[PDB]
């Protein structure tokens with residue numbers, strides 16, 4: 406009166422929806438509420454969830470604050486009683502009236518899966534929830550057989566919480582051999598009759614899936630619009646569970662869903678490596694990753710690692726912390742490694758090395774043939790003084806990593822050089838198993854001087870340090886790995902990557 410909104414073109418609307426396809430630990434949206442002069446409020450406030458705690462309900466704090474100041478009553482559904490790695494549902498003020506916030510609908514999960522079942526078709530079952538938009542002109546009946554009260558969905562978004570004695574159940578079939586999923590979102594009445602509301606189809610990439618939800622009944626004034634923007638992820642170390650959301654193409658619905666597979670013991674395969682070595686404790690810890698090795702996830706937030714140079718320094722603010730990553734290399738398409746630390750003004754804290762890669766499928770690991778791989782590496786050795794390897798582009802005399810891989814004998818042989826070194830400082834010997842390798846890193850008998858480069862200073866020696874690595878890319882044309890050891894006799898953390906060679 407008069408109400409002005411931004412004129413959104415169809416192109417802009419698609420772009421907006423496309424943005425919502427970015428993988429994240431979770432997502433949350435506000436339940437729409439009409440201001441007095443408007444007749445329709447779309448679903449518009451859709452935020453990523455970046456915290457990693459399963460006990461934190463997205464925006465429940467914001468809601469309880471408003472509820473309390475208005476004597477409301479907050480109720481929260483998460484599925485916390487069934488799921489171990491995912492949460493899905495709503496937090497809602499059930500005695501809501503007027504123009505104040507009603508609540509939120511969300512999903513989130515922890516430990517995006519780094520191992521998937523090897524193959525076959527696996528069943529996941531869970532629940533789903535939703536909020537509609539608010540619309541006076543959507544033919545939503547004053548009396549609704551499915552939803553409680555007067556004019557459900559008309560002035561305030563209607564939700565799964567408002568249903569009359571109905572349960573909202575989800576079922577999925579994941580075909581891990583073809584990386585495809587299908588599913589059904591159903592409603593069950595008190596008389597135990599099921600009605601299919603949406604069919605879901607999606608493709609799996611990394612530990613995420615992207616696809617669509619097709620409304621089964623387009624005459625439904627609330628659950629009647631298709632989505633071409635469904636996205637979710639597998640969660641748990643071994644894809645024990647899933648969770649995701651979809652947004653109706655007209656922003657008239659935001660649905661979330663969860664799922665859990667049965668107790669059957671399945672064989673799994675590694676799809677992702679993503680970890681870091683702390684350069685003070687020389688301990689390894691896992692990083693969150695969604696299957697894109699060129700994206701570094703810190704505190705549920707992302708750092709693009711790609712850049713114009715051989716290796717690139719990225720500097721990103723994450724929760725008031727200035728993170729710095731030096732990521733190598735531009736010739737590696739399916740993996741990245743390098744340094745990571747917190748910029749503490751002039752100093753630096755939590756110095757670490759990281760490595761990420763997208764594992765080759767086991768059935769694409771070559772069965773025979775001998776290949777050279779060439780790349781570089783990053784390392785810290787400490788034994789009184791510090792010795793360092795910093796990733797570089799000098800194949801002749803730099804910090805070279807060189808490998809001979811014999812796929813026939815399932816052997817990897819590697820050499821890690823110091824700059825100017827004529828003999829390597831580390832020798833790697835490993836066995837190939839599935840899409841990775843494991844073995845040892847050894848210095849020579851009498852090892853290498855901590856360069857310095859001093860005629861009184863010490864020498865470092867390491868014996869049978871455990872090495873873990875993977876093959877990355879469609880046909881294992883890239884390889885990488887790491888090793889770490891903590892000792893008073895000397896310590897080391899090292900990451901390396903290399904690119905398969907062709908004889909020119």
Ligand SMILES: C[As](C)(=O)[O-]
Nearest residue numbers: 697698699738739
């Ligand atoms: C193109 As890629 C290695 O980020 O899947």
